[PDB]
Design a protein around this ligand. Structure first.
Ligand SMILES: Cc1c(CP(=O)(O)O)c2ccc(Br)cc2n(CC2CCCC2)c1=O
Ligand SMILES: Cc1c(CP(=O)(O)O)c2ccc(Br)cc2n(CC2CCCC2)c1=O
Ligand SMILES: [Zn+2]
Ligand SMILES: [Zn+2]
Length: 229
């Protein structure tokens, strides 16, 4: 069930996993949802993606304090756009360790964003070098190649059926790939399929802006990306 907390929505997806949802009223597009994850592991919480704003991200922290009451060990963000990185300063104000793709931390200031404190590096084949992602527990992090943005990264949650492509992936009903302003049109299709190949056992694909979808979301996305080349 959708749990309301100030202006945000939280939905439990699995015993240790919640989706956080924040909204931006965007003229001509309506109220736009943005989703991230909250993962409980041991006696701590891990956050995937900020909300659109610092104020909303602070509300994520207030919800975690009230409903879970365990420390937030770290946050990782999936790309340097406002919907996923717009609340980075709220995390730093709360003393949370933050992580992003090295490329995201390089891009962040020009994107009007605050960089994460820690940079991730990726093996040639896209899996995060674990030494750059300490204490990530069940959070498995994978750079699929450039797509929605050059810096986009993806996460799977070990011990669940859940993976999250962020804005790389569109749901199975999408009428476009959306914002291609920062997209790599050459590599998009390959990166979407690489995400599917990295997390072959994931049946619940958490969507960046809509309800969770099946693996049809990944195939629909790569098929739309094929038309970009
Ligand atoms: C969720 C969503 C996005 C965000 P993303 O870049 O991650 O795909 C989006 C982006 C650009 C355009 Br142009 C339309 C979009 N739409 C459709 C609009 C919302 C309803 C009217 C069209 C999205 O839903
Ligand atoms: C940066 C940006 C986002 C965030 P992301 O691309 O990460 O989803 C966005 C998201 C939803 C909608 Br609906 C429009 C959006 N717009 C404006 C549209 C982009 C193409 C024309 C307008 C964003 O700029
Ligand atoms: Zn984006
Ligand atoms: Zn998006």
């Amino acid at each position: 069930g959708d749990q309301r907390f100030g202006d945000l929505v939280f939905r439990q997806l699995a015993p240790n996993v919640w989706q956080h949802t924040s909204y931006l009223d965007m003229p001509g597009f309506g109220a736009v949802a943005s989703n991230g994850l909250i993962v409980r592991d041991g006696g701590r919480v891990l956050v995937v993606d900020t909300a659109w704003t610092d104020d909303q991200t602070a509300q994520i922290l207030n919800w975690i304090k009230q409903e879970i009451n365990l420390p937030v060990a770290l946050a990782v963000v999936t790309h340097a756009h406002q919907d996923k990185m717009g609340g980075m300063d709220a995390l730093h104000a709360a003393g949370i360790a933050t992580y992003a793709n090295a490329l995201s931390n390089q891009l962040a200031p020009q994107e009007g964003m605050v960089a994460a404190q820690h940079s991730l590096t990726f093996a040639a084949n896209g899996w995060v070098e674990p030494a750059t992602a300490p204490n990530f527990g069940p959070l498995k992090v994978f750079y699929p190649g450039p797509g929605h943005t050059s810096d986009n990264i993806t996460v799977g949650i070990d011990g669940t059926d859940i993976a999250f492509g962020g804005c790389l992936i569109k749901d199975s009903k999408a009428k476009s790939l959306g914002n291609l302003g920062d997209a790599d049109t050459e590599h998009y299709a390959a990166s979407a399929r690489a995400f599917g190949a990295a997390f072959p056992k994931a049946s619940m694909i958490v969507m960046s802006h809509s309800a969770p979808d099946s693996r049809a979301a990944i195939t629909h996305t790569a098929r739309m990306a094929d038309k970009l080349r």
